[PDB]
Symmetry: C3
């Protein structure tokens, strides 16, 4: 990976600006439930990661630029997960590129396990806060020399999950008849890639966590560090088992199935949030 410093981020951004004239104001990272969001983007240019020098590589992932709900967007189709062995610089560079391209708001989804006992499979949990277990343990994405062109050395994570975007998301769900599926909660990052043990889930629930997943927080930290507002949502793809005696367990195909089942609704929700954002 190339260092996600201003020099390298500029080179990548400048290369992208030759390929498209679209100045995105919203960046979207597609997780669970957002698998067909790129189809909804109109007047789009699709740039495979392979066509961007010094951009991380993960068919190839794509950067999609276009209009969604009357706004200019860049959609990241293809993520770089820490459990896959990717570096901090790999995860940070795409977010910092979004910043240089013009992104003001980052919207992201992911799949998570439901710790909170009131959660149902397929529920949406808007992140209102997080617990960054890797970050507390010296694997924070920002470890290393601070890049002052982007942000400060010790970023505050106050209002990390923009309260006004959260309020809007809830309002849109309620107005469109699926407010009953929507919660707000604390997301804890398990580095992964193992699912959480019953003892681990019990610990995490008692720490005050509502959902547990293996991603997202590193991007959120980079976004907040460089001043991008964040809206993040976990799709509850499994209900955490807290009891060792239980034979119930997380199953990959069912986790993927839940994402796919909820995709139309999740994308609709994101689209309807975007159309309500103030603009001009």
């Amino acid at each position: 990976s190339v260092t996600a410093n201003i020099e390298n981020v500029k080179k990548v951004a400048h290369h992208i600006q030759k390929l498209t004239s679209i100045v995105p104001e919203i960046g979207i990272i597609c997780g669970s439930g957002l698998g067909k969001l790129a189809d909804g983007v109109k007047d789009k240019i699709t740039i495979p990661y392979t066509k961007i020098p010094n951009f991380p590589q993960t068919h190839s992932g794509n950067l999609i630029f276009g209009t969604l709900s009357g706004r200019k967007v860049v959609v990241m189709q293809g993520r770089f997960h820490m459990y896959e062995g990717y570096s901090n610089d790999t995860v940070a560079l795409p977010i910092r590129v979004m910043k240089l391209l013009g992104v003001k708001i980052l919207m992201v989804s992911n799949a998570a396990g439901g710790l909170n006992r009131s959660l149902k499979l397929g529920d949406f949990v808007i992140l209102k806060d997080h617990i960054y277990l890797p970050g507390l343990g010296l694997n924070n994405i920002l470890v290393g020399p601070n890049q002052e062109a982007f942000g400060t050395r010790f970023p505050a994570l106050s209002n990390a999950y923009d309260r006004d975007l959260r309020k809007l998301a809830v309002q849109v769900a309620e107005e469109n008849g699926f407010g009953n599926l929507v919660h707000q909660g604390v997301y804890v990052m398990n580095g992964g890639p193992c699912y959480e043990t019953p003892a681990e889930c019990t610990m995490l629930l008692n720490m005050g966590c509502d959902v547990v997943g293996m991603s997202t927080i590193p991007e959120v930290v980079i976004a907040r560090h460089c001043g991008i507002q964040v809206f993040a949502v976990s799709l509850v793809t499994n209900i955490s088992v807290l009891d060792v005696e239980s034979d119930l367990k997380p199953n990959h195909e069912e986790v993927l199935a839940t994402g796919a089942q909820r995709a139309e609704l999740m994308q609709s929700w994101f689209e309807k949030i975007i159309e309500k954002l103030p603009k001009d």
Copy 2:
């Protein structure tokens, strides 16, 4: 560090071992510190020093693999382990377990020495692990971080019944019928990366997290074993009782644990 624990490299190591012994092990046993006696009962033994195995990790006496039978069943015993607090890599720790898989191991029995958090524990008690909290794993130091080796298992392994409940039940029964059931507990093991012992504040936090014992090993091996379908039984010997507040200031047990493991193996189901 060391060679990637992929199918090609693990196969190469396994094939080398299969030229040094004709014993196909069904059960793998990992001896913890002060617990080398678990190998002493091995009948018709064949000893392979780690130095004889190219690409197998090396200790820094030499470590050995011991093949033979215990209570009639074919076993491989690991004498010398690779601890994460020593600076060994994920691949180093993973490779021996994946080698055991290819050699034919279906059940892994692991022992370690641990600190007692649960206040009902006494020095010298055995705590069968029923579950774990992998603090390094939750914090982005999980042994499986990196490309998944699909030949061994799936990207996101579930850890349900990680400590096989039928093996736990059998182990408790064997202890009770041999008159040391009073020494045996079941509990949750939490891994401290180490190598520092836990401070009183750490011990209190860990106890309140729902942990019964704390140690510096084992979980990484358990994760790799479960990832590739090996059933796991694991037991901690309580060698220290954790102090919970700042204001406040073995040999026979190894032999007993040896006997216990032997008597468990005698009763293991056999297809």
Copy 3:
């Protein structure tokens, strides 16, 4: 960049020993509140880190030798924080150099967020214990081959924060009229460099932590490993927010610097000579 082994640590200590004849008994690592401690030292011999070969670089840091309240000291001005990406050996080496130079007591300050709800901005929290979140998660400074020259493989952290040094520190504060600022508590390390979220702060408070910061514990572990007594104090530079819907740190340090400096000087004055 160099292993903190006996061979490398000795080379560094020997280089320092030809630049100064002062044999330090007390080492002091300046965090928040101790920025001006170097100015108060008498018979100063300032050695910049650039002038010590094999010594880690941060810039330009200084090792100041001299006397403080009649006792020989070495003051580290310029620390090596793990959130900056320094290696374990980088952080360990200066402490082990201190050991070889003659240091018996290490006094350290830092800036920390107040979790305990009774704390006020500018309070002093003497560390009596810690929770080393990085260490529990496989990022302990001692991971790797144990350097037997300095200590044992599995160091115990019983009495890590020497109880007699804590007693002395509280007594000095009480008799100089600022005992009302002094608390004793548990420090938890957040690797950093992000400040802790409300959910993180709530979790940490419920684990039994009184203050949270991003330093100190690694140095304390190396010091205890090699048998140096430790006194550590956090300056409360921020009050943790525990619920969502929610410069000041640098101002608190600069404001309380004089008092903390005075406190450290007066502690060194009352230390046992035998």
